[PDB]
Design a protein around this ligand. Structure first.
Ligand SMILES: [Ca+2]
Ligand SMILES: [Zn+2]
Length: 223
């Protein structure tokens, strides 16, 4: 996250870190047994880490649980990143508490202008590499589809939305992929892609979760 702040230990209780020997993507806990992340974060051998703040220090509130199965969206296209969402089932149910909580799925889609909270352990430099050990947060509004489509001609589909600042300076970045974009208490997006990080007129692009609620509900109930 570039231009964000330190969230605070466990202030984003639904945030997860996907680890395969090191942190490689974020995710969101939707209930005691399931996590939603991005399809492009798919890997074999994932361990989900909940109640994390510093990913390099075991501070006492973590739960490390291996995944039993991963389900990438049936129509995920890795070339365009359309339908970039994937579900991860935990081998054991997580113990929800103040530090580990699930986030609600939306009942409707959010409007442009709505302020959201984006979080993760990704790069914090636009021009440079600096990976933080503690969770960074960023408040950013959803942008109108017109400004999103003008920035990425012929690349935005109905399953994506842009959030951020066109002036640049604030944005999600690599290492943040798969993490949450929560607006008005609902999980509305998943960190998916962008053009570099925090560049002027290149906002981040997020998977539009409101379009997948029936798929999510049906899939977890049958697995
Ligand atoms: Ca830790
Ligand atoms: Zn990514």
């Amino acid at each position: 996250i570039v231009g964000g702040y330190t969230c605070g230990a466990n202030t984003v209780p639904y945030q997860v870190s996907l680890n395969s020997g090191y942190h490689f993507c974020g995710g969101s806990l939707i209930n005691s047994q399931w996590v939603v992340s991005a399809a492009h974060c798919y890997k074999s051998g994932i361990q989900v880490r909940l109640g994390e703040d510093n990913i390099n220090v075991v501070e006492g509130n973590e739960q490390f649980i291996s995944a039993s199965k991963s389900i990438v969206h049936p129509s995920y296209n890795s070339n365009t990143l359309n339908n970039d969402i994937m579900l991860i089932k935990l081998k054991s149910a997580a113990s929800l508490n103040s530090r580990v909580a699930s986030i609600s799925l939306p009942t409707s889609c959010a409007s442009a202008g709505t302020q959201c909270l984006i979080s993760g352990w990704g790069n914090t430099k636009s021009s440079g590499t600096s990976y933080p050990d503690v969770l960074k947060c960023l408040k950013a509004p959803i942008l109108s589809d017109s400004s999103c489509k003008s920035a990425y001609p012929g690349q935005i589909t109905s399953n994506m939305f842009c959030a951020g600042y066109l002036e640049g300076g604030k944005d999600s970045c690599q290492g943040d992929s798969g993490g949450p974009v929560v607006c008005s208490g609902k999980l509305q997006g998943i960190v998916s892609w962008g053009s570099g990080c925090a560049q002027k007129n290149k906002p981040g692009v997020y998977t539009k979760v409101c379009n997948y609620v029936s798929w999510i509900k049906q899939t977890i109930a049958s697995n």
